[PDB]
Curated annotation (Swiss-Prot):
Belongs to the calcitonin family. SMART domains: CALCITONIN (SM00113). One of its GO terms (molecular function) is hormone activity. Disulfide bonds join 1-7. This is Calcitonin. It comes from the Eukaryota. Keywords: Amidation, Disulfide bond, Hormone, Secreted. Causes a rapid but short-lived drop in the level of calcium and phosphate in blood by promoting the incorporation of those ions in the bones. It comes from Anguilla japonica (Japanese eel). It is found in: Secreted. GO terms for cellular component: extracellular region. The modification Proline amide is found at residue 32.
Amino acid sequence: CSNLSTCVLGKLSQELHKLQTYPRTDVGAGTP
Ligand SMILES: *[C@@H]1O[C@H](CO)[C@@H](O)[C@H](O)[C@H]1NC(C)=O
């Protein structure tokens, strides 16, 4: 980082895309 603004926004946005509340399985069973 260097901006300390676009840093923050970009980091948390990228994190939310990556993790996204861990979409492992979503149908009924919900297997790991
Ligand atoms: C600004 O923010 C982005 C996104 O988080 C980051 O990748 C980058 O290293 C930061 N600094 C610059 C100079 O772009």
